[PDB]
Write a protein that binds this DNA or RNA. Structure first.
Ligand SMILES: [Mg+2]
Ligand SMILES: [Mg+2]
Ligand SMILES: [Mg+2]
Ligand SMILES: [Mg+2]
Ligand SMILES: [Mg+2]
Ligand SMILES: [Mg+2]
Ligand SMILES: [Mg+2]
Ligand SMILES: [Mg+2]
Ligand SMILES: [Mg+2]
Ligand SMILES: [Mg+2]
Ligand SMILES: [Mg+2]
Ligand SMILES: [Mg+2]
Ligand SMILES: [Mg+2]
Ligand SMILES: [Mg+2]
Ligand SMILES: [Mg+2]
Ligand SMILES: [Mg+2]
Ligand SMILES: [Mg+2]
Ligand SMILES: [Mg+2]
Ligand SMILES: [Mg+2]
Ligand SMILES: [Mg+2]
Ligand SMILES: [Mg+2]
Ligand SMILES: [Mg+2]
Ligand SMILES: [Mg+2]
Ligand SMILES: [Mg+2]
Ligand SMILES: [Mg+2]
Ligand SMILES: [Mg+2]
Ligand SMILES: [Mg+2]
Ligand SMILES: [Mg+2]
Ligand SMILES: [Mg+2]
Ligand SMILES: [Mg+2]
Ligand SMILES: [Mg+2]
Ligand SMILES: [Mg+2]
Ligand SMILES: [Mg+2]
Ligand SMILES: [Mg+2]
Ligand SMILES: [Mg+2]
Ligand SMILES: [Mg+2]
Ligand SMILES: [Mg+2]
Ligand SMILES: [Mg+2]
Ligand SMILES: [Mg+2]
Ligand SMILES: [Mg+2]
Ligand SMILES: [Mg+2]
Ligand SMILES: [Mg+2]
Ligand SMILES: [Mg+2]
Lengths: 63, 110, 137, 117, 195
RNA sequence: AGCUGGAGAUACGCUUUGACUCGGGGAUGUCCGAAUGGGGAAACCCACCUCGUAAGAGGUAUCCGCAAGGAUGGGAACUCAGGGAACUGAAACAUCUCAGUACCUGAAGGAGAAGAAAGAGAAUUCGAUUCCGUUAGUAGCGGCGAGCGAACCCGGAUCAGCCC
RNA sequence: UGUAGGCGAACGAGCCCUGAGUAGGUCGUUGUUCGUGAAACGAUGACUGAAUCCGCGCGGACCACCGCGCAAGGCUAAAUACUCCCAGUGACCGAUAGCGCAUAGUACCGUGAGGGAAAGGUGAAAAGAACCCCGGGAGGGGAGUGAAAGAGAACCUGAAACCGUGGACUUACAAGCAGUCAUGGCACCUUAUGCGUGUUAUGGCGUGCCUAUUGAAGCAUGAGCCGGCGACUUAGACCUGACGUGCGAGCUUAAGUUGAAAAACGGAGGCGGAGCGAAAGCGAGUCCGAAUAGGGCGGCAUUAGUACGUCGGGCUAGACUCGAAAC
């Protein structure tokens, strides 16, 4: 059998697509925020690059 | 420890039966069954000459003897003969009472 | 054949890796290096300072429709086909899902499918080519 | 299926012991040291096969200047005179065999010396 | 390329599948079948726990001999194997169309040479073996080739099964390996040869 | 028709009014042992009561019951139940895991358990219990960390519900 | 002797009511995925304590509606687990292997609980060596037996270390990782009169092995020597890649069932076919948003998938083997 580390299920890892690994933007989330407005609008959904092979086996079944 | 009867402690000859040898240097020689040892498969017929030596022993005498004796053999003699020698053996024919299972080759008894 | 003439297809069976077994190939250490955690199994997959950790926005369920494109459908040459009945005999695999249709390529000739759900424009390209489409009522 | 070493090992061993038969002490009779002595033996073998040309080239040259000086020339001047005439292209070994035949060697010595003049 | 016997003698169909795949498909099939029949019975003492033993043999240091701690180790003579055999099922499902294509290629390797077909025509009396030797010998089965018969009537197979050069194979239980194995094949025709 | 154990050795003999050997019952069965007349350092000490000629035989523990008649102890693994670890993983370590694992103890059989819906469940379907496949690493639980992980539907093995 | 087949026994085993100190509750706790989490339900320690058929419990805080069901009494085969024991079988072992034991829980170690071995082979058959010789013997030489005594009871083979006997060549001014090439002297000629085999004198050349290392002849580690045991495995309807095969826009079974000197049936189920989204949900579009700027995605290159086999890796489990002090 296999398992998927449940931390990856709702975390900034989206297996969706042509197999690529979309991920969130992180800096300043729900901690203090008193700085740039176009920065605070910039924590949404981008994607990682040299890590994707680990994230796939994090959740090959795409939960 | 290996029993030596793959033949189920059965014997195809009685004691005192006339018998011919199939194999060895005695093939084609003749003899009555002087001693029949079933479970070991040993068969004694007169004429299996063997020169046992002993005047070393004291018990028979301070000297003793070389002497001629029998050497018992495997059920590798033909069990029973007839005017035709050798050959196999049918059974289950009836005696004058029928209580004796008997023997035959082509036909006959014993 | 005669069976001692049998041979599996060339390159259909590669031999094993006999890691070990001395200087003609893969010697003292097997494939493993000199020391480190190349010893006996244990660690799995994580960097062992920090996790690459990001936040989580979270929901739990979903329920998809089964999919039926109309491009594979126009090639059928035998229309007026009931949903469950006449689709089961030519694919449409899921047994505990609902059916739906997408607007992939051109519907062309008339038909009458009875799907469990459909996109708003599939009625456009369907009825525009004279075609009743009956969702469950 | 079990498959014990058995006859394999001892074949290999006897091969090594059979390569090692001139050898002193247990370099001849125990396997382990037999195989070990053969390690350095391989090194020395592969060296000498192309060093032996160095030694023999030495012996040729060393024999040539002897007759050279026997006549009152010397190796450097004598091969320079056998080169200064283009036509002498024989190997030093053949100059040695000539050094074993004095008359022809002296003919080449007078030939060479008539080319540095 | 087909005839029958005393019953009728009319050709069935000569059609054969693919021409015999030169071991590209037949090989894996007989290999799978020899594996599927194979049983996994090969126990070996576990690298520790199966052996009969105790504890730590002696002191960890200062004994002046090699560092050790039990009598049941694979480097010890006393046994327990690293990596010994254990029971296991070598069986696996070969995908079905390969089994069918394999049997078909086997029959096809029978037709373009050594196969023969039969309705009945056995003319076997009381399943006498002697009459079986006569019947097959008239068809060139003189005992100088291996034979695989496949019949379904228990009398004729009961006649044949004692011959050294023939083997009996009941019913549909045909074997790609049994027919690759023998150097001749004789088929009921009336059964699997037709649809 | 041989037999007289392995055992290979001699002597003594048994057997065709049937031996041996093989299957089936019977009958003897010293003492210890749950041991149980009482004691005790098992296999040994010391008694009592009826038979009564005597040699010899039978009884003499406790628990349930009137009374038959049950019970005590043993059994490789398997079952259920009363208790219940720690290494270990977590690259430390408390929650967590390792695990109701190992272990101890009790009850019992050739099995045991469980079992005939104040249920699952979301079709106003199912219709006892157990077991396999699967659903499925889905749901979900988790210092939301290491990790832990169902059930229904569906497919088989077997299918009996009877009593107060 | 059996095998196929057939017979085979006196005695022998074996198919108006419908469960209260309870349902319920509070406090401590716990099981199933359930770690107080919104925490339902069962489950019980303590204290309490209902209702009857226009009645009671549940549907995961709770309410109404809508459904499922009648608790607080019991019994119940079979399918299921194991294997002390029996048979059958084996791409299982064959005397360091295989159970520890070719038998023995013996010998031996321990006050004890407990630990715990080596194993074997005349020969066809004992015909198991009469007799003679040297010796108290032991051991041996003859003779016989036997096919073989080149089998004789220290009885199949009988490798290596290691100990000897004999013969060739050699060695007592030599400095030496034991060899390497070359030349000469002697010996020999059964893959062998040669670009020979054994040996040898002299010349030149030449820092054991492995490991661990920036760096090893090292005065760094291991190792007396020969034998033999001795370390990258197995597992799984797992994930991932390479190669191969069947079928291919489709591909395939699992449990099992029926047969087995052979395998077929078995579609429950799995993967491909649509993606975007946190999800509702839309759908070749989709999320963000008040409409237009983007992200992932299809078109386009529609890159064809799937069931197996082998193999490279991954996972999980002793997971390449040995080794703790500890708990
Ligand atoms: Mg998505
Ligand atoms: Mg004497
Ligand atoms: Mg390699
Ligand atoms: Mg190392
Ligand atoms: Mg390092
Ligand atoms: Mg572990
Ligand atoms: Mg893990
Ligand atoms: Mg050199
Ligand atoms: Mg030491
Ligand atoms: Mg053992
Ligand atoms: Mg005896
Ligand atoms: Mg007593
Ligand atoms: Mg007592
Ligand atoms: Mg730890
Ligand atoms: Mg701890
Ligand atoms: Mg336990
Ligand atoms: Mg117990
Ligand atoms: Mg009990
Ligand atoms: Mg509570
Ligand atoms: Mg918590
Ligand atoms: Mg052993
Ligand atoms: Mg040995
Ligand atoms: Mg033992
Ligand atoms: Mg003793
Ligand atoms: Mg002796
Ligand atoms: Mg001898
Ligand atoms: Mg010998
Ligand atoms: Mg002897
Ligand atoms: Mg022999
Ligand atoms: Mg010997
Ligand atoms: Mg000298
Ligand atoms: Mg010296
Ligand atoms: Mg060096
Ligand atoms: Mg250093
Ligand atoms: Mg050193
Ligand atoms: Mg040392
Ligand atoms: Mg499973
Ligand atoms: Mg491929
Ligand atoms: Mg694009
Ligand atoms: Mg694969
Ligand atoms: Mg590799
Ligand atoms: Mg990998
Ligand atoms: Mg260890």
């Amino acid at each position: 059998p296999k398992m998927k580390t449940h931390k990856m299920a709702k975390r900034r890892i989206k297996i969706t697509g042509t197999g690529k690994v979309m991920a969130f933007k992180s800096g300043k989330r729900h901690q203090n925020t008193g700085k740039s407005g176009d920065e605070i609008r910039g924590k949404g959904k981008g994607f990682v690059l040299a890590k994707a092979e680990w994230a796939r086996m994090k959740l090959m079944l795409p939960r | 420890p290996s029993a030596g009867s793959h033949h189920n402690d059965k014997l195809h000859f009685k004691k005192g039966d006339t018998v011919i040898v199939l194999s060895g240097k005695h093939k084609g020689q003749t003899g009555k069954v002087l001693l029949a040892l079933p479970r070991d498969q040993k068969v004694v017929v007169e004429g299996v000459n063997v020169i046992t030596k002993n005047v070393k022993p004291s018990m028979t005498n301070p000297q003793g003897g070389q002497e001629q004796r029998e050497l018992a053999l495997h059920a590798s003699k033909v069990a029973l003969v007839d005017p035709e020698t050798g050959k196999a053996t049918r059974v289950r024919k009836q005696i004058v009472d029928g209580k004796k299972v008997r023997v035959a080759v082509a036909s006959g008894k014993t | 054949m005669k069976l001692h003439d049998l041979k599996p297809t060339p390159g259909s069976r590669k031999d094993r890796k006999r890691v070990g077994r001395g200087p003609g190939g893969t010697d003292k250490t097997a494939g493993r290096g000199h020391k480190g955690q190349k010893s006996r199994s244990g660690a799995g997959k994580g960097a062992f300072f920090e996790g690459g950790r990001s936040r989580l926005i979270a929901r739990l369920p979903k329920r998809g429709f089964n999919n039926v494109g109309t491009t594979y459908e126009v090639v059928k040459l035998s229309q007026l086909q009931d949903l469950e009945d006449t689709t089961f005999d030519r694919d449409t695999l899921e047994a505990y899902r609902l059916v739906r249709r997408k607007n992939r390529p051109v519907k062309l000739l008339a038909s009458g499918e009875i799907s469990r759900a459909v996109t708003v424009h599939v009625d456009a390209a369907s009825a525009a080519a004279i075609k009743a489409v009956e969702a469950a009522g | 299926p079990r498959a014990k070493t058995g006859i394999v090992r001892r074949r290999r061993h006897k091969k090594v012991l059979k390569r090692a038969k001139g050898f002193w002490g247990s370099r001849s009779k125990q396997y382990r040291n037999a195989f070990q002595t053969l390690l350095n033996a391989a090194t020395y073998e592969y060296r000498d096969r192309r060093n032996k040309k160095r030694d023999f080239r030495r012996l040729w040259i060393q024999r040539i200047n002897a007759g050279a000086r026997l006549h009152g020339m010397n190796y450097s001047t004598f091969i320079n005179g056998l080169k200064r005439a283009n036509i002498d292209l024989n190997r030093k070994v053949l100059a040695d065999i000539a050094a074993r035949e004095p008359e022809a060697f002296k003919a080449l010595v007078d030939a060479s010396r008539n080319a540095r003049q | 390329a087909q005839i029958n016997v005393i019953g009728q003698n009319g050709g069935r169909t000569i059609e054969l599948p693919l021409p015999e795949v030169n071991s590209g498909v037949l090989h894996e099939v007989v290999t799978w079948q020899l594996a599927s029949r194979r049983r996994g019975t090969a126990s070996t003492r576990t690298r520790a726990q199966v052996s009969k033993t105790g504890r730590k043999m002696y002191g960890q240091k200062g004994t002046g001999n090699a560092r050790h701690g039990d009598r049941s180790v694979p480097t010890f003579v006393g046994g327990g194997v690293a990596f010994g055999p254990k029971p296991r099922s070598y069986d696996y499902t070969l995908p079905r169309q390969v089994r069918q294509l394999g049997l078909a290629m086997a029959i096809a390797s029978r037709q373009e040479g050594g196969k023969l077909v039969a309705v009945d025509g056995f003319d076997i009396a009381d399943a006498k073996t002697k009459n079986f030797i006569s019947w097959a010998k008239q068809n060139g089965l003189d005992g100088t080739e291996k034979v695989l018969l496949v019949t379904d009537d228990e009398n004729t197979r009961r006649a044949a099964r004692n011959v050294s050069w023939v083997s009996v194979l009941p019913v549909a239980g045909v074997n790609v390996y049994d027919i690759l194995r023998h150097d001749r094949l004789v088929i009921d025709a009336a059964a699997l040869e037709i649809v």
